[PDB]
PDB file of all heavy atoms in Angstrom:
ATOM      1  N   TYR A   1       2.917  -5.150  27.164  1.00  0.00           N
ATOM      2  CA  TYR A   1       1.749  -5.097  28.012  1.00  0.00           C
ATOM      3  C   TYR A   1       2.102  -5.183  29.497  1.00  0.00           C
ATOM      4  O   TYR A   1       2.838  -6.079  29.905  1.00  0.00           O
ATOM      5  CB  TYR A   1       0.801  -6.241  27.645  1.00  0.00           C
ATOM      6  CG  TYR A   1      -0.373  -6.393  28.584  1.00  0.00           C
ATOM      7  CD1 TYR A   1      -1.365  -5.416  28.653  1.00  0.00           C
ATOM      8  CD2 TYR A   1      -0.519  -7.537  29.374  1.00  0.00           C
ATOM      9  CE1 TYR A   1      -2.461  -5.560  29.496  1.00  0.00           C
ATOM     10  CE2 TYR A   1      -1.609  -7.690  30.227  1.00  0.00           C
ATOM     11  CZ  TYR A   1      -2.567  -6.684  30.299  1.00  0.00           C
ATOM     12  OH  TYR A   1      -3.649  -6.811  31.120  1.00  0.00           O
ATOM     13  N   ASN A   2       1.530  -4.274  30.305  1.00  0.00           N
ATOM     14  CA  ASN A   2       1.641  -4.289  31.777  1.00  0.00           C
ATOM     15  C   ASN A   2       3.100  -4.496  32.270  1.00  0.00           C
ATOM     16  O   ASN A   2       3.383  -5.384  33.083  1.00  0.00           O
ATOM     17  CB  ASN A   2       0.722  -5.395  32.349  1.00  0.00           C
ATOM     18  CG  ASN A   2       0.562  -5.331  33.842  1.00  0.00           C
ATOM     19  OD1 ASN A   2       0.610  -4.254  34.426  1.00  0.00           O
ATOM     20  ND2 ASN A   2       0.424  -6.487  34.490  1.00  0.00           N
ATOM     21  N   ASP A   3       4.011  -3.680  31.745  1.00  0.00           N
ATOM     22  CA  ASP A   3       5.424  -3.649  32.101  1.00  0.00           C
ATOM     23  C   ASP A   3       6.136  -5.042  31.992  1.00  0.00           C
ATOM     24  O   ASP A   3       6.587  -5.585  33.001  1.00  0.00           O
ATOM     25  CB  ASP A   3       5.598  -3.052  33.532  1.00  0.00           C
ATOM     26  CG  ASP A   3       7.042  -2.872  33.962  1.00  0.00           C
ATOM     27  OD1 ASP A   3       7.882  -2.546  33.098  1.00  0.00           O
ATOM     28  OD2 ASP A   3       7.345  -3.150  35.136  1.00  0.00           O
ATOM     29  N   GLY A   4       6.283  -5.561  30.768  1.00  0.00           N
ATOM     30  CA  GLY A   4       7.067  -6.769  30.555  1.00  0.00           C
ATOM     31  C   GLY A   4       6.449  -7.965  29.868  1.00  0.00           C
ATOM     32  O   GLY A   4       7.181  -8.919  29.599  1.00  0.00           O
ATOM     33  N   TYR A   5       5.119  -7.963  29.593  1.00  0.00           N
ATOM     34  CA  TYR A   5       4.488  -9.088  28.883  1.00  0.00           C
ATOM     35  C   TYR A   5       4.503  -8.680  27.419  1.00  0.00           C
ATOM     36  O   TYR A   5       3.797  -7.755  27.026  1.00  0.00           O
ATOM     37  CB  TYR A   5       3.082  -9.432  29.440  1.00  0.00           C
ATOM     38  CG  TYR A   5       3.106  -9.782  30.912  1.00  0.00           C
ATOM     39  CD1 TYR A   5       3.066  -8.785  31.889  1.00  0.00           C
ATOM     40  CD2 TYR A   5       3.213 -11.109  31.334  1.00  0.00           C
ATOM     41  CE1 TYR A   5       3.101  -9.102  33.249  1.00  0.00           C
ATOM     42  CE2 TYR A   5       3.206 -11.439  32.690  1.00  0.00           C
ATOM     43  CZ  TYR A   5       3.170 -10.428  33.644  1.00  0.00           C
ATOM     44  OH  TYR A   5       3.202 -10.735  34.981  1.00  0.00           O
ATOM     45  N   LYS A   6       5.412  -9.278  26.634  1.00  0.00           N
ATOM     46  CA  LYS A   6       5.690  -8.812  25.276  1.00  0.00           C
ATOM     47  C   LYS A   6       5.249  -9.747  24.180  1.00  0.00           C
ATOM     48  O   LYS A   6       5.353 -10.974  24.315  1.00  0.00           O
ATOM     49  CB  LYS A   6       7.194  -8.528  25.127  1.00  0.00           C
ATOM     50  CG  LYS A   6       7.655  -7.385  26.036  1.00  0.00           C
ATOM     51  CD  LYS A   6       9.166  -7.405  26.214  1.00  0.00           C
ATOM     52  CE  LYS A   6       9.643  -6.206  27.011  1.00  0.00           C
ATOM     53  NZ  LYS A   6      11.116  -6.266  27.204  1.00  0.00           N
ATOM     54  N   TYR A   7       4.681  -9.143  23.116  1.00  0.00           N
ATOM     55  CA  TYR A   7       4.134  -9.831  21.920  1.00  0.00           C
ATOM     56  C   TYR A   7       4.644  -9.071  20.706  1.00  0.00           C
ATOM     57  O   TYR A   7       4.668  -7.842  20.726  1.00  0.00           O
ATOM     58  CB  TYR A   7       2.587  -9.896  21.971  1.00  0.00           C
ATOM     59  CG  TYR A   7       2.059 -10.309  23.322  1.00  0.00           C
ATOM     60  CD1 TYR A   7       1.789  -9.359  24.308  1.00  0.00           C
ATOM     61  CD2 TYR A   7       1.907 -11.656  23.653  1.00  0.00           C
ATOM     62  CE1 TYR A   7       1.400  -9.738  25.591  1.00  0.00           C
ATOM     63  CE2 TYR A   7       1.480 -12.043  24.927  1.00  0.00           C
ATOM     64  CZ  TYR A   7       1.231 -11.079  25.891  1.00  0.00           C
ATOM     65  OH  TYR A   7       0.803 -11.435  27.149  1.00  0.00           O
ATOM     66  N   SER A   8       5.071  -9.786  19.660  1.00  0.00           N
ATOM     67  CA  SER A   8       5.616  -9.141  18.465  1.00  0.00           C
ATOM     68  C   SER A   8       4.750  -9.385  17.237  1.00  0.00           C
ATOM     69  O   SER A   8       4.048 -10.391  17.147  1.00  0.00           O
ATOM     70  CB  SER A   8       7.053  -9.588  18.216  1.00  0.00           C
ATOM     71  OG  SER A   8       7.905  -9.056  19.215  1.00  0.00           O
ATOM     72  N   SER A   9       4.791  -8.437  16.300  1.00  0.00           N
ATOM     73  CA  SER A   9       3.991  -8.451  15.078  1.00  0.00           C
ATOM     74  C   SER A   9       4.468  -9.367  13.968  1.00  0.00           C
ATOM     75  O   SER A   9       5.607  -9.843  13.930  1.00  0.00           O
ATOM     76  CB  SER A   9       3.892  -7.034  14.500  1.00  0.00           C
ATOM     77  OG  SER A   9       5.100  -6.558  13.913  1.00  0.00           O
ATOM     78  N   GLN A  10       3.527  -9.588  13.059  1.00  0.00           N
ATOM     79  CA  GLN A  10       3.710 -10.275  11.783  1.00  0.00           C
ATOM     80  C   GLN A  10       3.204  -9.321  10.726  1.00  0.00           C
ATOM     81  O   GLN A  10       2.281  -8.547  11.004  1.00  0.00           O
ATOM     82  CB  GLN A  10       2.982 -11.632  11.736  1.00  0.00           C
ATOM     83  CG  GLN A  10       3.616 -12.724  12.622  1.00  0.00           C
ATOM     84  CD  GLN A  10       5.062 -13.041  12.284  1.00  0.00           C
ATOM     85  OE1 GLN A  10       5.459 -13.137  11.120  1.00  0.00           O
ATOM     86  NE2 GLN A  10       5.888 -13.208  13.302  1.00  0.00           N
ATOM     87  N   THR A  11       3.835  -9.291   9.558  1.00  0.00           N
ATOM     88  CA  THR A  11       3.405  -8.367   8.505  1.00  0.00           C
ATOM     89  C   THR A  11       2.554  -9.087   7.477  1.00  0.00           C
ATOM     90  O   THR A  11       2.942 -10.149   6.985  1.00  0.00           O
ATOM     91  CB  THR A  11       4.620  -7.717   7.830  1.00  0.00           C
ATOM     92  OG1 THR A  11       5.438  -7.118   8.841  1.00  0.00           O
ATOM     93  CG2 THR A  11       4.224  -6.673   6.772  1.00  0.00           C
ATOM     94  N   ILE A  12       1.436  -8.467   7.108  1.00  0.00           N
ATOM     95  CA  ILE A  12       0.567  -8.952   6.034  1.00  0.00           C
ATOM     96  C   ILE A  12       0.427  -7.770   5.073  1.00  0.00           C
ATOM     97  O   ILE A  12       0.606  -6.619   5.482  1.00  0.00           O
ATOM     98  CB  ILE A  12      -0.780  -9.573   6.494  1.00  0.00           C
ATOM     99  CG1 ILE A  12      -1.602  -8.575   7.340  1.00  0.00           C
ATOM    100  CG2 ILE A  12      -0.538 -10.928   7.220  1.00  0.00           C
ATOM    101  CD1 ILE A  12      -2.993  -9.021   7.710  1.00  0.00           C
ATOM    102  N   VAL A  13       0.191  -8.052   3.796  1.00  0.00           N
ATOM    103  CA  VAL A  13       0.178  -7.021   2.769  1.00  0.00           C
ATOM    104  C   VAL A  13      -1.197  -6.932   2.105  1.00  0.00           C
ATOM    105  O   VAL A  13      -1.753  -7.951   1.700  1.00  0.00           O
ATOM    106  CB  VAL A  13       1.322  -7.295   1.720  1.00  0.00           C
ATOM    107  CG1 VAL A  13       1.413  -6.165   0.684  1.00  0.00           C
ATOM    108  CG2 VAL A  13       2.685  -7.488   2.406  1.00  0.00           C
ATOM    109  N   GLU A  14      -1.717  -5.703   1.964  1.00  0.00           N
ATOM    110  CA  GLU A  14      -2.992  -5.441   1.283  1.00  0.00           C
ATOM    111  C   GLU A  14      -2.882  -5.889  -0.171  1.00  0.00           C
ATOM    112  O   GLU A  14      -1.842  -5.677  -0.793  1.00  0.00           O
ATOM    113  CB  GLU A  14      -3.379  -3.945   1.334  1.00  0.00           C
ATOM    114  CG  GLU A  14      -3.651  -3.381   2.729  1.00  0.00           C
ATOM    115  CD  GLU A  14      -4.894  -3.812   3.490  1.00  0.00           C
ATOM    116  OE1 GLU A  14      -5.777  -4.502   2.920  1.00  0.00           O
ATOM    117  OE2 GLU A  14      -5.004  -3.403   4.666  1.00  0.00           O
ATOM    118  N   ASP A  15      -3.919  -6.565  -0.681  1.00  0.00           N
ATOM    119  CA  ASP A  15      -3.935  -7.039  -2.054  1.00  0.00           C
ATOM    120  C   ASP A  15      -5.284  -6.716  -2.686  1.00  0.00           C
ATOM    121  O   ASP A  15      -6.320  -7.008  -2.094  1.00  0.00           O
ATOM    122  CB  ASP A  15      -3.636  -8.544  -2.111  1.00  0.00           C
ATOM    123  CG  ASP A  15      -3.344  -9.002  -3.518  1.00  0.00           C
ATOM    124  OD1 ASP A  15      -2.207  -8.819  -3.968  1.00  0.00           O
ATOM    125  OD2 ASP A  15      -4.288  -9.453  -4.203  1.00  0.00           O
ATOM    126  N   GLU A  16      -5.280  -6.120  -3.887  1.00  0.00           N
ATOM    127  CA  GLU A  16      -6.535  -5.750  -4.558  1.00  0.00           C
ATOM    128  C   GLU A  16      -7.353  -6.958  -5.027  1.00  0.00           C
ATOM    129  O   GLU A  16      -8.545  -6.797  -5.279  1.00  0.00           O
ATOM    130  CB  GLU A  16      -6.269  -4.830  -5.769  1.00  0.00           C
ATOM    131  CG  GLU A  16      -5.712  -3.476  -5.373  1.00  0.00           C
ATOM    132  CD  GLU A  16      -6.711  -2.456  -4.870  1.00  0.00           C
ATOM    133  OE1 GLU A  16      -7.605  -2.058  -5.652  1.00  0.00           O
ATOM    134  OE2 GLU A  16      -6.548  -1.999  -3.716  1.00  0.00           O
ATOM    135  N   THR A  17      -6.737  -8.148  -5.145  1.00  0.00           N
ATOM    136  CA  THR A  17      -7.433  -9.336  -5.654  1.00  0.00           C
ATOM    137  C   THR A  17      -7.792 -10.334  -4.544  1.00  0.00           C
ATOM    138  O   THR A  17      -8.905 -10.860  -4.551  1.00  0.00           O
ATOM    139  CB  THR A  17      -6.559 -10.026  -6.744  1.00  0.00           C
ATOM    140  OG1 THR A  17      -6.267  -9.088  -7.778  1.00  0.00           O
ATOM    141  CG2 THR A  17      -7.221 -11.258  -7.367  1.00  0.00           C
ATOM    142  N   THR A  18      -6.846 -10.653  -3.652  1.00  0.00           N
ATOM    143  CA  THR A  18      -7.059 -11.697  -2.648  1.00  0.00           C
ATOM    144  C   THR A  18      -7.251 -11.151  -1.230  1.00  0.00           C
ATOM    145  O   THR A  18      -7.288 -11.936  -0.292  1.00  0.00           O
ATOM    146  CB  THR A  18      -5.903 -12.717  -2.683  1.00  0.00           C
ATOM    147  OG1 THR A  18      -4.694 -12.061  -2.289  1.00  0.00           O
ATOM    148  CG2 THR A  18      -5.746 -13.402  -4.076  1.00  0.00           C
ATOM    149  N   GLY A  19      -7.402  -9.839  -1.093  1.00  0.00           N
ATOM    150  CA  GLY A  19      -7.571  -9.195   0.210  1.00  0.00           C
ATOM    151  C   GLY A  19      -6.229  -8.906   0.849  1.00  0.00           C
ATOM    152  O   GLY A  19      -5.835  -7.745   0.998  1.00  0.00           O
ATOM    153  N   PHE A  20      -5.512  -9.978   1.198  1.00  0.00           N
ATOM    154  CA  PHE A  20      -4.150  -9.967   1.718  1.00  0.00           C
ATOM    155  C   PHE A  20      -3.271 -10.996   1.051  1.00  0.00           C
ATOM    156  O   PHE A  20      -3.774 -11.957   0.480  1.00  0.00           O
ATOM    157  CB  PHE A  20      -4.127 -10.312   3.216  1.00  0.00           C
ATOM    158  CG  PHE A  20      -4.802  -9.371   4.171  1.00  0.00           C
ATOM    159  CD1 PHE A  20      -5.790  -9.833   5.040  1.00  0.00           C
ATOM    160  CD2 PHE A  20      -4.368  -8.054   4.297  1.00  0.00           C
ATOM    161  CE1 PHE A  20      -6.360  -8.978   5.991  1.00  0.00           C
ATOM    162  CE2 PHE A  20      -4.958  -7.190   5.226  1.00  0.00           C
ATOM    163  CZ  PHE A  20      -5.948  -7.658   6.070  1.00  0.00           C
ATOM    164  N   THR A  21      -1.950 -10.835   1.224  1.00  0.00           N
ATOM    165  CA  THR A  21      -0.872 -11.786   0.910  1.00  0.00           C
ATOM    166  C   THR A  21       0.114 -11.769   2.113  1.00  0.00           C
ATOM    167  O   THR A  21       0.074 -10.857   2.953  1.00  0.00           O
ATOM    168  CB  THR A  21      -0.150 -11.457  -0.423  1.00  0.00           C
ATOM    169  OG1 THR A  21       0.599 -10.261  -0.262  1.00  0.00           O
ATOM    170  CG2 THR A  21      -1.085 -11.312  -1.584  1.00  0.00           C
ATOM    171  N   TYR A  22       1.012 -12.752   2.197  1.00  0.00           N
ATOM    172  CA  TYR A  22       1.993 -12.708   3.276  1.00  0.00           C
ATOM    173  C   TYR A  22       3.168 -11.781   2.819  1.00  0.00           C
ATOM    174  O   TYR A  22       3.250 -11.435   1.636  1.00  0.00           O
ATOM    175  CB  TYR A  22       2.432 -14.127   3.706  1.00  0.00           C
ATOM    176  CG  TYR A  22       3.098 -14.180   5.069  1.00  0.00           C
ATOM    177  CD1 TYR A  22       2.562 -13.493   6.162  1.00  0.00           C
ATOM    178  CD2 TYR A  22       4.264 -14.914   5.269  1.00  0.00           C
ATOM    179  CE1 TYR A  22       3.179 -13.531   7.415  1.00  0.00           C
ATOM    180  CE2 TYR A  22       4.891 -14.957   6.514  1.00  0.00           C
ATOM    181  CZ  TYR A  22       4.337 -14.276   7.587  1.00  0.00           C
ATOM    182  OH  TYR A  22       4.951 -14.342   8.811  1.00  0.00           O
ATOM    183  N   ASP A  23       4.011 -11.322   3.770  1.00  0.00           N
ATOM    184  CA  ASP A  23       5.092 -10.376   3.489  1.00  0.00           C
ATOM    185  C   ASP A  23       6.256 -10.959   2.646  1.00  0.00           C
ATOM    186  O   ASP A  23       6.974 -10.184   2.002  1.00  0.00           O
ATOM    187  CB  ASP A  23       5.654  -9.810   4.810  1.00  0.00           C
ATOM    188  CG  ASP A  23       6.326 -10.808   5.759  1.00  0.00           C
ATOM    189  OD1 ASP A  23       6.127 -12.032   5.585  1.00  0.00           O
ATOM    190  OD2 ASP A  23       7.022 -10.358   6.695  1.00  0.00           O
ATOM    191  N   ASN A  24       6.452 -12.295   2.674  1.00  0.00           N
ATOM    192  CA  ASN A  24       7.586 -12.979   2.027  1.00  0.00           C
ATOM    193  C   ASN A  24       7.527 -13.066   0.486  1.00  0.00           C
ATOM    194  O   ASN A  24       8.581 -13.179  -0.139  1.00  0.00           O
ATOM    195  CB  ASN A  24       7.765 -14.394   2.603  1.00  0.00           C
ATOM    196  CG  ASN A  24       6.554 -15.309   2.502  1.00  0.00           C
ATOM    197  OD1 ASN A  24       5.519 -14.989   1.894  1.00  0.00           O
ATOM    198  ND2 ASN A  24       6.664 -16.482   3.115  1.00  0.00           N
ATOM    199  N   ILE A  25       6.333 -13.034  -0.115  1.00  0.00           N
ATOM    200  CA  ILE A  25       6.199 -13.163  -1.574  1.00  0.00           C
ATOM    201  C   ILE A  25       5.911 -11.808  -2.263  1.00  0.00           C
ATOM    202  O   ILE A  25       5.709 -11.786  -3.484  1.00  0.00           O
ATOM    203  CB  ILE A  25       5.098 -14.218  -1.941  1.00  0.00           C
ATOM    204  CG1 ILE A  25       3.721 -13.861  -1.334  1.00  0.00           C
ATOM    205  CG2 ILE A  25       5.527 -15.655  -1.581  1.00  0.00           C
ATOM    206  CD1 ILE A  25       2.603 -13.859  -2.341  1.00  0.00           C
TER     207      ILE A  25
END
C-alpha cells in the first residue's frame, strides 16, 4: 500500500460443512 506499507495474507479453506477451515489441517 502507498509505496511501502506492507501487509501479508493468511490462507483459509472453503468447507462444505463448516464454511471454512484453517490451511494447516
Side-chain angles (χ1 to χ4, degrees):
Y1 173 67
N2 191 31
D3 185 35
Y5 302 84
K6 296 162 175 178
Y7 315 89
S8 290
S9 72
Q10 289 301 318
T11 306
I12 57 174
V13 185
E14 296 290 352
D15 193 81
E16 294 280 297
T17 303
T18 65
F20 296 125
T21 69
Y22 198 45
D23 64 344
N24 57 6
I25 58 128

